Amino acid sequence: DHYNCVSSGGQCLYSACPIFTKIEGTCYRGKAKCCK
């Protein structure tokens, strides 16, 4: 979720994760990606 994503270094993005990050979980009631 958003809390864990941001606390663990990531960012919540609805569509693509930018280059040199990868999808590691979700945010926003599972509608966005946590990119780390």
- Measured CA to CA, the distance from residue 8 to residue 22 in angstroms comes to 14
* Structure method: X-ray
CB 35 within 8 A of CB 23: yes
CB 3 within 8 A of CB 28: no
Position 11, amino acid: Q
Stated in angstroms to one decimal place, the resolution of this structure is 1.9
Neighbours of 12 (CB within 10 A): 17
Which stretches of the chain are DSSP H helices? 2-7
CA distance readout (Å), 18 to 3, 12, 24: 20, 11, 13
Beta bridge partners of 13: 33
